[PDB]
Design an enzyme around this catalytic site. Structure first.
Site, PDB file in Angstrom:
ATOM      1  N   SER D 246       5.552 -42.585  49.116  1.00  0.00           N
ATOM      2  CA  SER D 246       5.444 -43.996  49.779  1.00  0.00           C
ATOM      3  C   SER D 246       6.531 -43.898  50.401  1.00  0.00           C
ATOM      4  CB  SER D 246       4.391 -45.094  49.275  1.00  0.00           C
ATOM      5  OG  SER D 246       3.686 -45.191  49.234  1.00  0.00           O
ATOM      6  N   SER D 284       0.515 -41.663  49.502  1.00  0.00           N
ATOM      7  CA  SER D 284       1.298 -41.409  49.411  1.00  0.00           C
ATOM      8  C   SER D 284       1.932 -42.262  51.317  1.00  0.00           C
ATOM      9  CB  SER D 284       2.481 -40.002  50.025  1.00  0.00           C
ATOM     10  OG  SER D 284       3.833 -40.680  50.323  1.00  0.00           O
ATOM     11  N   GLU D 286       3.015 -43.018  54.253  1.00  0.00           N
ATOM     12  CA  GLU D 286       4.021 -43.533  54.250  1.00  0.00           C
ATOM     13  C   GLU D 286       4.037 -43.642  56.128  1.00  0.00           C
ATOM     14  OE1 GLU D 286       5.669 -39.175  54.397  1.00  0.00           O
ATOM     15  OE2 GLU D 286       4.841 -39.413  52.422  1.00  0.00           O
TER      16      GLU D 286
HETATM   17  C1  OAE Z   1       0.417 -44.706  41.328  1.00  0.00           C
HETATM   18  C2  OAE Z   1      -0.143 -43.547  42.903  1.00  0.00           C
HETATM   19  C3  OAE Z   1      -1.328 -43.742  42.471  1.00  0.00           C
HETATM   20  S1  OAE Z   1      -0.197 -44.518  43.931  1.00  0.00           S
HETATM   21  C4  OAE Z   1       1.225 -43.589  44.229  1.00  0.00           C
HETATM   22  C5  OAE Z   1       1.740 -44.400  45.291  1.00  0.00           C
HETATM   23  N1  OAE Z   1       1.142 -45.208  45.952  1.00  0.00           N
HETATM   24  C6  OAE Z   1       2.167 -45.844  46.803  1.00  0.00           C
HETATM   25  O1  OAE Z   1       3.189 -46.502  46.407  1.00  0.00           O
HETATM   26  C7  OAE Z   1       0.668 -46.726  47.847  1.00  0.00           C
HETATM   27  N2  OAE Z   1       1.873 -47.409  48.854  1.00  0.00           N
HETATM   28  C8  OAE Z   1      -0.080 -47.272  47.062  1.00  0.00           C
HETATM   29  C9  OAE Z   1      -1.535 -46.019  47.221  1.00  0.00           C
HETATM   30  C10 OAE Z   1      -2.129 -47.057  46.683  1.00  0.00           C
HETATM   31  C11 OAE Z   1      -2.690 -47.885  46.623  1.00  0.00           C
HETATM   32  C12 OAE Z   1      -1.438 -49.211  46.164  1.00  0.00           C
HETATM   33  C13 OAE Z   1      -0.127 -48.945  46.888  1.00  0.00           C
HETATM   34  C14 OAE Z   1       2.997 -43.145  45.222  1.00  0.00           C
HETATM   35  O2  OAE Z   1       3.754 -43.773  46.464  1.00  0.00           O
HETATM   36  O3  OAE Z   1       4.026 -43.316  44.338  1.00  0.00           O
HETATM   37  N3  OAE Z   1       1.423 -42.508  43.357  1.00  0.00           N
HETATM   38  C15 OAE Z   1       0.422 -42.316  42.553  1.00  0.00           C
HETATM   39  C16 OAE Z   1       0.992 -41.221  41.747  1.00  0.00           C
HETATM   40  O4  OAE Z   1       1.945 -42.405  40.949  1.00  0.00           O
HETATM   41  O5  OAE Z   1      -0.322 -40.742  41.028  1.00  0.00           O
END
Ligand code: OAE
Ligand code: OAE
Ligand code: OAE
Ligand code: OAE
Ligand code: OAE
Ligand code: OAE
Lengths: 364, 364, 366, 367
Positions: D246, D284, D286
């Site tokens: 993200s 992610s 973005e």
């Molecule tokens: C935990 C994950 C599965 S979600 C992803 C994470 N996405 C976000 O932060 C989004 N805003 C978001 C998406 C869905 C729910 C809440 C927030 C990232 O950017 O790191 N990384 C993955 C993972 O590490 O496997």
């Protein structure tokens, strides 16, 4: 000929002097109407019931752009120049409304029209012409090259201000709406935004809707009208006994994102009259300002600026779009006469005598 | 002739057998290339340096639709059939890529091509052809009707699978990219999602960017190359005075909203190579699936289904788009040769000898 | 109590058994309604006329996603979780409809609710809750923290199928529509798509429109009603004699893909249009559509029982007409269910008069 | 400490005086950084590695709106106030960037903050606060209520112009980017359009990308760096030795752009991201938001647009576009260099990109 108000249909608001899109100063409209042949259709040989409608936002001699914004109700159709509108918020040149089969011909013809008329230096600005369609497939030999470059030139050069012809003309020639005869319709509203009164003008090319859903002044009128269902060779082709292009002009000095909001209001006016947007009905709206103009290669001209959160001003404009759209759709129906076209398909204009009787009973 | 890899340019990922969009089975490509006349340009007389590129998603005999989605980087340009794609997530018929002046001719020619090939009952499905443009104004008589219907038929009928010609061909014939010769480029990636493999294919028509921004394999290379500036008398660079269309094919069974995601990855590949999307640079991407197909008037065929939150599968596909786009752009430059066109304008192909020398020095 | 049909208002189409969004099997609805205090408003001390409405697309115990698509009529408002819907075509967890001042409290309370109920492994899927608002500023102390986390838990946990309470309840409690009392309304349609019949269900939280524009069954009814204009301290606050936003949730059991649900959501505007409003500049008017048959198990393979062609007019038009008709009726059902209310600062808003409405309908549709 | 340029990383264009978003006059930035606890995570007890970053487009005392437009690269995330921006082309109040678990608390705290500071008449304009997130789930107790209303008030009230702190601060505290430590980064460009000069300022909250894709100044550097892979439960959690012992982008400009023109600016951010190699992961989130500080809308008044620019004016627009791309590219690298090694929840450890190795690689590539 009588328009909707003349048959006793009531509407809300105050129309401009002409009750047409040309109530917006500088806008010019032209039609070329192509009607030839009868009987069985052979591709390439008619019958033809088609044409083209041209709207010059700033008149036929303008090289400047107008601020613009669009909306989609259902996008199953073509309207060129719209990526440009979405990106830079303006378009150059005229708007053409036509039959689906004619799009490519009109597009290239508009380019040809510019050669000789436009300084070689400005020619590249003429390369993204705005052309839109609805399908005249029941009444017209769609693929048969019925429309010529000369037809397009004639509409471009013949366009003018003043009263706008409605009904079976230009792009609307072979169209069908609410199971009655379709075509061109237009209306306007003058709206009070505090101490300033703006004009909102609407023109439609209507090819949408079902009779069972149609409302005129809120009256579900399809079942109140007797007969007038479409026929083929003398046999009832629909009923118990067996796309839409919206152009909005305004002199309000709106920015492009504000014009997108105007265009999104058209749907509410369409909703008033009952249709539900068929799966293959290409229903689109485009709104432009004639006061917010962009000289070619120059500084945009914006004579005043309006706050989006100014409800007094914006609601007046929004209500204008909704009312003018509602009325333009009814004006279309009333202006369109019964027509027989390709394959002896026959589509009736909504009966004037019956409509007036119903309106009189409902609104004594 | 050598492609980018053959001159020592390194890229990430695994290319398909042909390293081209036709690595996606069933896809066909055809070009008609129009090169005639020399010297001073007279509108309507050439010189001509233009053409058309056709892509049949399911081959030239298919009447079925493919699932599709699009993205816009900068929308100053035309791509028809895109309202349809946004609305119903599919398009029928071929993709045509061409010069700006040819759009209307190509659009009508595609309709004409269907007459007699498609059953009368299915002809309406051929009425929203997909045609896109970039402007060949420096090398080509744009308004001069250099492209004919016969030219368009030849590309439609001559399209085939197998290796794809790149460089100064078809729609890319008269284009200019990064101040070098522009044109057609193509590349592919075979990607892994667990035990499953998919192919992502990319074809570009490149007419974008500035030499001083260009990166190849991350190397800012415009200042490393000596000479090769355009001549109009050098017209750019230290001695001055002395748009982009991306088509993405995949055999992954993706839904329309998922293909929009694929299309939005194109920008990241473009970004790798340094350009910043000029104000009037029409930069667009369109993605389609050859396995999610919709028989005309029938039940959609979706052989398997993918979860949008399945990172292992989706990321593999996304990285495929990014890498194939990056390489397709460089393949274009390497395939395009020096060309002299309208008004004796001269544009150089990026010099192979200097490129290979620079890559050898950077990547020993 | 009577609903719109019971007062003689005619509508087109066939409603489901309950004539409500819960006609779509598995959908659960819960309300918490907060009404306390009278008289002059002091921020932080009420009076309060607010609440929250919860819709669980697959029931309160589901951890799975539903396919979904949205539309905007006028975007001056908040609806969270919508970037997710646009991107991946689904959302997890419940929909919450509430007052504007409650959005953050509800958003965090939905996260808290998941803790202990959801496997730690699946908790990240609970971090983009779906919360939407309209403003209850005339009847409610908006900034005054009238809604509590316990209120939100009660609606989440108390939600059920069957008949859905309408009117001055849940998120709709302090709302105003067409210059009459606003609130919650619901309706459904069962629609014939060839040999299959699908259900389209709609729930609205209405806080939009002007009395002068209002149409019911096509009748411009504002001028036909005598009196019932809003007041303050006994003073008429609107109309000729002065001085004497909209959230739409669409459920269907049709197995639609996300881009197809966007199409469904875009139909809501047409049903709104039937009832006369013109979308004010600051009126946040939004629609969200989801399928209960196209479901996405967490970390698993999407389940799509059948597939529908976008160009199949017979099936798509039936669904589209369902949305338009159910939206139109949901809006009238809201008005009829909502009773006269006095709230913050002695602001008084009248429910549309039942006796007058029934008399007008009888005169128009004998 | 050192910023990217200080370690020998080259970039194109001319940075502003501060090389930060605050090079756009009147913009104020504030951080609250929450770092407490060590060891095993218990939900509701920490450890906490989170925070909030506040950006006041026109300063903390302004009641006015700024012209604004947005773009989405991949929309799996939250950013409130964006329907408003899409509809009316402006937003009121500050931008908050934070961890996912904090969104609702920050949203309500921003409303509370306005009570007593804003005339009762104008309170309704404070009801659509702008709040955006990335997920600090590896280093932080996300659901554990580590962020308080007081933390948010402190960032709102403490915000200022001048140099902006980067790295493990504010909303970026617990983040991870390109498999190295993530966080806050900022950069600016002063661009020329004929005789006119404008400033484009960028701030990022970076939580995106994989080490294997990372490019710095075009150099694919992940494989060139030795070591510095993350460790979870004592063991290397990624890279060739795994198993053994993200993105939020905020763009400010003083150019007098209309809302649709600011959407174009925001869409340029993807190109700068593309330069650095990432490919936008499925989950992610973005996003980019762009605003003008010269096109301002007084509350309930007439918009103020001091000059007006033609979208087809390539000389002016291309200068601004290039500014966004270059400043985004640099803000991303500035983040990495600013962020230091951190150990958080469950003793997860993520390394800052090694300065010594990075400097050595740049020296070798760019003699
Ligand atoms: C935990 C994950 C599965 S979600 C992803 C994470 N996405 C976000 O932060 C989004 N805003 C978001 C998406 C869905 C729910 C809440 C927030 C990232 O950017 O790191 N990384 C993955 C993972 O590490 O496997
Ligand atoms: C022929 C039909 C199947 S298409 C539809 C027609 N749609 C359009 O005109 C669209 N712009 C369009 C859609 C698809 C291809 C070309 C144009 C209409 O509005 O009348 N009517 C149907 C039919 O009569 O059964
Ligand atoms: C000539 C190109 C291929 S180069 C490029 C541009 N050069 C210029 O803008 C020169 N001032 C110029 C000189 C002579 C005629 C026109 C422009 C550059 O520096 O990048 N523009 C292209 C083009 O015009 O088609
Ligand atoms: C001639 C120009 C001003 S337009 C631009 C050209 N843009 C496109 O081709 C667009 N599709 C387009 C935009 C507007 C009208 C028609 C096509 C390019 O990419 O070469 N190059 C400039 C220029 O050379 O100075
Ligand atoms: C208070 C008003 C100025 S805002 C509007 C109100 N809009 C909303 O509820 C929006 N979701 C919203 C818009 C802006 C901030 C917060 C919510 C409504 O629908 O009643 N009514 C006006 C008014 O009563 O004069
Ligand atoms: C641990 C990271 C910072 S590295 C990154 C990922 N590593 C893996 O997914 C490992 N299989 C793994 C090992 C131990 C726990 C979880 C995953 C990689 O290769 O880049 N994912 C991040 C993360 O999960 O927070």
């Amino acid at each position: 000929g009588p328009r909707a108000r003349d048959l006793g249909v009531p509407f809300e608001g105050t129309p401009g002097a002409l009750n047409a899109i040309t109530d917006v100063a500088g806008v010019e409209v032209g039609h070329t109407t192509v009607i030839s042949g009868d009987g069985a259709m052979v591709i390439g040989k008619g019958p033809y019931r088609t044409g083209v409608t041209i709207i010059h936002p700033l008149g036929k001699t303008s090289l400047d752009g107008v601020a613009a914004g669009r909306a989609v109700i259902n996008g199953t159709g073509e309207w060129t120049g719209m990526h440009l509108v979405d990106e830079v918020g303006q378009f150059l040149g005229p708007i053409a409304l036509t039959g689906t089969g004619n799009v490519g011909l009109v597009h290239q013809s508009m380019m040809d029209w510019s050669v000789g008329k436009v300084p070689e230096e400005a020619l590249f600005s003429r390369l993204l012409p705005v052309v839109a369609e609805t399908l005249d497939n029941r009444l017209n030999d769609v693929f048969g090259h019925g429309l010529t470059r000369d037809h397009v030139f004639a509409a471009l050069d013949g366009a003018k201000g003043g009263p706008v012809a409605e009904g079976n003309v230009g792009g609307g020639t072979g169209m069908i709406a609410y199971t009655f005869k379709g075509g061109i319709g237009t209306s306007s509203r003058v709206v009070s935004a505090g101490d300033t009164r703006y004009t909102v003008g609407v023109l439609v090319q209507a090819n949408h809707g079902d009779r069972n859903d149609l409302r005129i002044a809120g009256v579900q009128i399809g079942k109140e009208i007797k007969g007038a269902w479409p026929e083929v060779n003398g046999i009832v082709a629909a009923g118990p006994d067996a796309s839409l292009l919206i152009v909005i002009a305004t002199d309000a000095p709106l920015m492009p994102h504000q014009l997108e909001r105007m265009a999104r209001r058209a749907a509410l006016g369409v909703g008033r009259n009952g249709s539900t947007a068929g799966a293959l009905s290409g229903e689109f709206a485009l709104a432009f300002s004639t006061s917010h103009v962009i000289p070619l290669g120059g500084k945009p001209r914006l004579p005043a600026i309006i706050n989006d959160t100014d409800s007094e001003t914006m609601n007046a404009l929004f209500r204008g779009v909704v009312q003018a759209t509602e009325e333009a759709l009814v004006n279309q129906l009333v202006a369109s006469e019964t027509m027989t076209g390709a394959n002896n398909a026959k589509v009736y204009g909504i009966p004037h005598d019956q409509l007036a009787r119903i309106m009189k009973a409902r609104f004594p």
